[PDB]
Amino acid sequence: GSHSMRYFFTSVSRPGRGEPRFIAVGYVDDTQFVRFDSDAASQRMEPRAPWIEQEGPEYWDGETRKVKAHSQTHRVDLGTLRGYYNQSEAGSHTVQRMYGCDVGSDWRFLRGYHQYAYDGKDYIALKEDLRSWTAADMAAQTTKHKWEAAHVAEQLRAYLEGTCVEWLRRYLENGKETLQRTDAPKTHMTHHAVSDHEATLRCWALSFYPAEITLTWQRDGEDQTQDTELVETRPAGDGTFQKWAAVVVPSGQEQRYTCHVQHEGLPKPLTLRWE
């Protein structure tokens, strides 16, 4: 019954002309609720979920002000990093940041996080104890020494354990109709003959929420991984997700195979078998 809130930020420099492209999105579990795009006309934090549109003007003005201050720090960082790595000003680079908090089943603070990356690789991250830092290289080491003297961890720990948890619980209640509801996967199986002696059985899991799910194939009550295929979980586009697993079997022996579906929206796992 745990839940989380997370913010993702991406900044891409554009040496040819202008400022970096900045995009920020907020999520509660697997539901996006806010976004900001430096390329958009509003230049404001915008709603992406109906339950967040309940917040008044002071909320949106405050979030907009903060996300802008966020983009400016990233703009500065891109330049600072370019120097740390002694890189040319002609190429485009990327800085990413992700932070947030988790609440356990008891709805109390469980864990917090604050990680940073440069060009797609770990740069510096705040440890689980929320007091020490993990620096990937010597560029990150200099950043770490500066953040220790300024006591950045302490400031973050206060937010992650307090403000972050408090707002996560508020959002959870305001959007309880969907956020506190699980959507069990709708399942079925398809059969396709690949030859005169072989056939493919595909097990489908549709319209489920949250995204976390496990699909497994068994043959005569035993797990089978050979001759199977599992696609990565994908968004349906309406807030739910999709997944399927397939196995190639000898024509006429389909009944030996069973598809097992595990999901928190299910009291107990589902077992499907072909007619």
Binding site: Y7, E63, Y84, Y99, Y123, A150, V152, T163, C164
Partner: peptide, 9 residues
């Protein structure tokens, strides 16, 4: 709700 302060690298 976003964090208020944010230090640079």
């Amino acid at each position: 709700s976003l964090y208020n302060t944010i230090a640079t690298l």
